[PDB]
Amino acid sequence: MSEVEDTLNRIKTHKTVLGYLIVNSEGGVVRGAFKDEEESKNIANSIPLLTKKARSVVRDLDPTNDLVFLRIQTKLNEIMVAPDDEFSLIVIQTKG
């Protein structure tokens, strides 16, 4: 298919995006498209724990209602994560 593998190529090519990284449910790197490897390795380990911890937050308040999309916003950067059961998509977009 062109459709997932093209959209993922499109959001990378898109201006003011550092890189898109797919995390496996077992905290593993399927695709990692950042500049420096330290950042990509760091993002691969650190962020999927925040999303699991942030999933337990929304879950406690209402255990029917599951996480569909998490967006953190830092001083310099934004961090946006779209979690699913099979895979999790992560991006880092610099604020305009």
Binding site: E38, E39, N42, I43, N45, S46, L49, L50, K53, A54, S56, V57, V58, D60, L61, D62, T64, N65, D66, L67, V68, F69, L70, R71, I72, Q73, T74, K75, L76, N77, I79
Partner: protein, 110 residues
């Protein structure tokens, strides 16, 4: 004056509830629609952990010195949207809906 903002926040389209926290964890003021003190103690424990964890992780595990988190937007099933900000020591957790859920809530009220 400091009550009028709570009245101003329910007035914004979509807004169900709000809950403010001290640096401690005590809830300062909540909405009457969201449960008072019972949920406000519960919802403090989660967000104070979620914040302090994320605050920590971005300064260490991302290896980005001097980059503190400003907002957190947990979007969910149905149309819930949990926005977490921080002004000075105090923090808070607003809950908005979307057109579909707002319309559902207005129909339920009707």
């Amino acid at each position: 004056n400091a009550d009028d903002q709570l009245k101003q926040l329910s007035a914004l389209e979509g807004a169900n509830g709000y809950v403010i926290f001290n640096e401690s964890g005590i809830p300062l003021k909540r909405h009457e629609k969201s449960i008072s003190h019972e949920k406000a103690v519960h919802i403090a424990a989660l967000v104070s952990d979620l914040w302090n964890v994320s605050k920590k992780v971005i300064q260490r595990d991302l290896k980005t010195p001097e980059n503190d988190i400003e907002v957190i937007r947990l979007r969910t099933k149905h149309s819930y949207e949990y926005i977490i900000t921080q002004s000075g020591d105090f923090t808070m957790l607003a809950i908005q809906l979307c057109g579909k859920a707002i319309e559902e809530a207005k129909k339920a009220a009707a």
